[PDB]
Amino acid sequence: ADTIVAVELDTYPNTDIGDPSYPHIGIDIKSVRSKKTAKWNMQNGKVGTAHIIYNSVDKRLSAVVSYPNADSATVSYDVDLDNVLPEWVRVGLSASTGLYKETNTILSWSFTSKLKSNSTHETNALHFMFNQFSKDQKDLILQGDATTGTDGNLELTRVSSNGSPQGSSVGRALFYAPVHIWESSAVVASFEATFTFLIKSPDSHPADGIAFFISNIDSSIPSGSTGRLLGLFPDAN
Amino acid sequence: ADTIVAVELDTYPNTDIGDPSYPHIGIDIKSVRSKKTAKWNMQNGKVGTAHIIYNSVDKRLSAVVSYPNADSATVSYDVDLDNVLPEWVRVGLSASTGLYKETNTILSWSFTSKLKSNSTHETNALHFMFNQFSKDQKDLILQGDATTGTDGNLELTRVSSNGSPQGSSVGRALFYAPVHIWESSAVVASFEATFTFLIKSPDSHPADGIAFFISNIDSSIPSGSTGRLLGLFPDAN
Amino acid sequence: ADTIVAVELDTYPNTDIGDPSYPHIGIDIKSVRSKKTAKWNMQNGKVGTAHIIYNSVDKRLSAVVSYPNADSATVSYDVDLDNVLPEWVRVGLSASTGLYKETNTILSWSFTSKLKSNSTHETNALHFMFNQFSKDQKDLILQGDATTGTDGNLELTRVSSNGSPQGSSVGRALFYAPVHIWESSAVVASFEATFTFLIKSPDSHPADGIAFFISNIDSSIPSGSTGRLLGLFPDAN
Amino acid sequence: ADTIVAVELDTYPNTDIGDPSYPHIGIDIKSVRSKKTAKWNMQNGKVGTAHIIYNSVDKRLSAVVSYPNADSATVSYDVDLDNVLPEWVRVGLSASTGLYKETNTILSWSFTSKLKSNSTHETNALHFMFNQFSKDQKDLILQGDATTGTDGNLELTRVSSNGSPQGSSVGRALFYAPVHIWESSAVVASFEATFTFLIKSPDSHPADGIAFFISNIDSSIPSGSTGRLLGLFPDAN
Amino acid sequence: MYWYPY
Amino acid sequence: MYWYPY
Amino acid sequence: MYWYPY
Amino acid sequence: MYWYPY
Ligand SMILES: [Ca+2]
Ligand SMILES: [Ca+2]
Ligand SMILES: [Ca+2]
Ligand SMILES: [Ca+2]
Ligand SMILES: [Mn+2]
Ligand SMILES: [Mn+2]
Ligand SMILES: [Mn+2]
Ligand SMILES: [Mn+2]
Numbered sequence A, B, C, D: 001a002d003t004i005v006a007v008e009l010d011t012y013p014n015t016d017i018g019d020p021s022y023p024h025i026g027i028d029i030k031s032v033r034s035k036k037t038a039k040w041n042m043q044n045g046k047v048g049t050a051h052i053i054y055n056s057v058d059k060r061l062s063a064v065v066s067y068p069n070a071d072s073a074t075v076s077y078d079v080d081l082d083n084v085l086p087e088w089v090r091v092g093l094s095a096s097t098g099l100y101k102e103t104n105t106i107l108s109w110s111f112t113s114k115l116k117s118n119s120t121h122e123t124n125a126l127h128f129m130f131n132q133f134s135k136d137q138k139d140l141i142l143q144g145d146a147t148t149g150t151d152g153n154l155e156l157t158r159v160s161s162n163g164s165p166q167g168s169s170v171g172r173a174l175f176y177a178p179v180h181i182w183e184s185s186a187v188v189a190s191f192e193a194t195f196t197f198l199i200k201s202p203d204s205h206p207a208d209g210i211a212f213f214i215s216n217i218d219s220s221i222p223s224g225s226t227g228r229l230l231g232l233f234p235d236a237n
Numbered sequence E, F, G, H: 001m002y003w004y005p006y
Helices: none
Strands: A004-010 A024-029 A036-039 A047-055 A059-065 A073-078 A086-096 A105-116 A125-132 A140-144 A170-175 A188-198 A209-216 B004-010 B022-027 B034-039 B047-055 B060-066 B073-078 B089-098 B103-117 B123-130 B140-144 B169-175 B186-201 B208-217 C004-010 C022-028 C036-039 C046-057 C060-066 C073-078 C086-099 C103-117 C123-132 C141-142 C169-173 C186-200 C209-216 D005-012 D025-031 D036-039 D047-053 D060-068 D073-078 D088-096 D105-118 D122-131 D140-144 D170-177 D188-198 D210-218
Touching: A004 A047, A004 A059, A024 A059, A024 A073, A036 A073, A086 A105, A105 A170, A188 A209, B004 B047, B004 B060, B004 C103, B022 B060, B034 B073, B047 B140, B047 C186, B060 C186, B089 B103, B103 B169, B103 B208, B140 C046, B186 B208, B186 C046, B186 C060, C004 C046, C022 C060, C022 C073, C036 C073, C103 C169, C103 C209, C186 C209, D005 D047, D005 D060, D025 D060, D025 D073, D036 D073, D088 D105, D105 D170, D188 D210
Parallel strands: none
Antiparallel strands: A004 A024, A004 A209, A024 A036, A047 A059, A047 A188, A059 A073, A086 A170, A086 A209, A105 A125, A105 A188, A125 B123, A140 A170, B004 B022, B004 B208, B022 B034, B047 B060, B047 B186, B060 B073, B089 B169, B089 B208, B103 B123, B103 B186, B140 B169, C004 C022, C004 C209, C022 C036, C046 C060, C046 C186, C060 C073, C086 C169, C086 C209, C103 C123, C103 C186, C123 D122, C141 C169, D005 D025, D005 D210, D025 D036, D047 D060, D047 D188, D060 D073, D088 D170, D088 D210, D105 D122, D105 D188, D140 D170
């Protein structure tokens, strides 16, 4: 089945499957059980920023999530993506709710991928930046309850007419064109992602989180991957 | 039919359909009969560069074709793209051969599109850059006889094993993801494309040309668009 | 004297020196008497944006000034910069006040210059971006009453403690490193500047304006260039 | 005195002061005695590429030097630049020869520095790229025997009319404008440098190397810093 | 409501 | 001025 | 020397 | 086709 690698912004602690006893940021490598986590002082109703970076020289994936004038959380895990992902992949944002809910709004999203092979400074690069989402976003693949438009924002999960988060929702946004993430011959390969989110829950005690993920070109939402599964995994193994 | 705007690097003068009496560069707006051309001193066997620019403030499409240490060819045409192209399109490269041939090799291709809606500086941008094409270029849509892999380069038209160009050949290369070329609320919309070519002709009698084009998302090669049609138009009206 | 090319955001009509009878935007080529202007519906107290573009292929300098959800002002002027400016220059922002005042606050400023010599694609480029200015902005050359630090912003002219604009004030902000604006062997030379301003006037009678300018590396504020001279020219010829 | 941090491409093994018994790449923190080295299969007469990267999230400085179709050397050292450099610095290239000599040619050099502070996506950035050096390079500060022009290349050390390397030479190239490398409040700060060199020595057994360095704004060449000192340090402490 | 001089 | 759940 | 057709 | 000193 699918191949996933993700940086999750987990808002609810599902201890029954590894989650720490608190909102956290994590790095998932083919499993919902993060290979590493860091606690995250999530702030309901506040706009935040996420930063994921990686380079083949250090083979270290790191993420930073922060809020204006507040401390930030950081997490890093050493991993050689070449041994985990196919050389061609798709990148996207995933989010879900379950019993408890929360809005999972993306206000902006940009990605940059660079690959420099074995020939004088030959560099291949891809860069996209969404500072505003249109109703008809032809360069995005929306899966599940994902929707764009509602005055420039990407709503990953179900939101009512009045604006409240619906429980049991799943939605993903993948950039249309495939990304060449690594090449068995590049001096240096690197990518960096940034997106500003807005997680707001009325029935305070929000769930379940947002995750930036990388997968095989043809990935789709596994059935029953609502709640704790973040719309990324079919089981908690 | 399709809607096509293209900058063509014409190598054979078919002065029967409006063509000038010499190798030229022109701007085509939905027709093979260029709105404006300019003599182009084509150098067989030499690598060259083509720069195409356009911004919504001036509503002027300009192109520059040069060869190292040589005079350059320049052509512009005041045209408002909002009233010619759908707001979502695809960009690519098309080339052809007929009775006479030439190699239509692409060594690199980069593209950048910026859109600034009136919620100011909120900018959306797409940028891709190709310095080398691999045998399996997933982020590219190859049509006709177009192929990549030939060690780094993109061969738009048929070239034999030994390396000679074949006659009656048509090929195109479109970028996978659709592009948002213009938007009503846009304060400023611009884009610029750059590519290096190598048109080689053993029998110093090349034909038919290479072109950078913009079209509807589902454009495909028209029938019999080999030769003088550069694989862009169905007829010569 | 100095050599100055500037795009001015004039707020007071001094129709005695050629000024239009209303707030306008114009292009100045070595004189305060604009080569061409355009009515500008200035909105006191609102943040605005100014986009300036120019490329050597068209040899046309264009500017766009807009306000969120409002019609924009646009002005262009066919001018060949090679025969007006030395190949090395400095770029900056200048503003002034006289009998009447206004705040000439800059919230952000970005600049990008590209030069492609005929050794093709061999491209030289300079790019700087300011989203916030610190109290000690070393990569900036402040002249006159210009100051940074006021929490993020760049105050070109004098503003009291309580925050009101002072009359008879002149200030400039030039980027430290010189810029290579044009070069003989250049296939294509271009540059684009963007900045957000906030012109505020307690007594709804603003003056005198803000301008983006290009000049010789050692340009400095001319004497008595307060008010109508926007701190760019010595006289009004 | 000066504050230095550099990635050196050491071509001669000065064991008498720590150098490994072979050409190497190293990371120098305020001392010519690298905190870490990696052997480097230098190739006299071949054009090579250097890549230095760093980000505040990982606080890890890494460098990659390679040659077309050959293996590359890599070196990394964990260091928090905030505790080593002033927040404002200058960046440059340094090279030297001694008894033994070598050409220390720079064919291209580009740098990018990004700083994102504590306010919604406010990013400050600086980017310059030299693909060709002009005789009169006003945006570069040349020290010592450094010279530009000789058909687009930066020659860091003395080269004779006929083209042979002179012993006992020192030269540096610093980018004119200061760089804000870190800020006591930025979510993420990062920089990346790339330059292609050409080290050629006739009297084979070359010396002494090239180094990418970062220093206090007003750094200058220490006297007697030829040979083993790489034009960076006043002594081997 | 901050917007006008003329 | 919505809510930190801590 | 590779350069000309016409 | 100058020289690797190894
Ligand atoms: Ca969870
Ligand atoms: Ca023709
Ligand atoms: Ca005036
Ligand atoms: Ca040494
Ligand atoms: Mn978790
Ligand atoms: Mn034609
Ligand atoms: Mn005026
Ligand atoms: Mn050493």
